[PDB]
Design a protein around this nucleic acid. Structure first.
Length: 159
DNA sequence: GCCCTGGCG
DNA sequence: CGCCAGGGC
């Protein structure tokens, strides 16, 4: 299974071994980027991310969460933003690869894994369609070979 | 780098 | 909702 091999490889790159995992993968829309606009989180994907209490829906809120950045192979802190005026939620502080706009389509993959040692954690990977890019291979693993990539398209599902 | 807030169909 | 947009520091 090419998706399971990928997920296991991503966890092992952080020095853990995968017990189980969930994935949220999103083909970005042109407005999305690393954080000036962030990656907009579809409502159906809120439950994939950590609980962020919104104590007052009339006020902005913000949470951090740790995530292993696959491109840099280092642990990072992402920001999970609630902006009340829309209302909507964004991820920001992602890898700067996402800022380059001339190589669409772009993909983000988030993986939440339970580890065999009883720990758990988030993982992030991303890609575009430029020369040497990884969009096609990653899109095929997350979504299959039969469906068309489409800006905004996303999947949330167990591994 | 990441903040925040204007807007649209 | 899903998405477009842009100035501040």
């Amino acid at each position: 299974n090419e998706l399971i091999k990928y997920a296991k490889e991503l966890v092992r790159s952080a020095g853990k071994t995968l017990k189980s995992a969930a994935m949220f993968a999103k083909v970005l829309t042109p407005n999305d980027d690393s954080g000036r606009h962030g990656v907009l989180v579809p409502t159906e994907a809120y439950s994939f991310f950590p609980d962020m209490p919104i104590s007052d829906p009339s006020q902005n809120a913000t949470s951090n969460f740790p995530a292993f950045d696959s491109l840099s192979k280092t642990h990072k802190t992402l920001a999970y933003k609630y902006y009340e005026r829309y209302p909507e939620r964004r991820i920001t502080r992602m890898h700067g690869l996402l800022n380059e706009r001339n190589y669409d389509p772009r993909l983000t993959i988030f993986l939440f894994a339970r580890h065999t040692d009883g720990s758990s954690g988030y993982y992030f990977d991303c890609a575009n369609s430029g020369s040497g890019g990884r969009f096609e291979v990653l899109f095929a693993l997350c979504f299959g070979e039969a469906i068309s990539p489409k800006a905004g398209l996303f999947v949330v599902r167990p591994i």
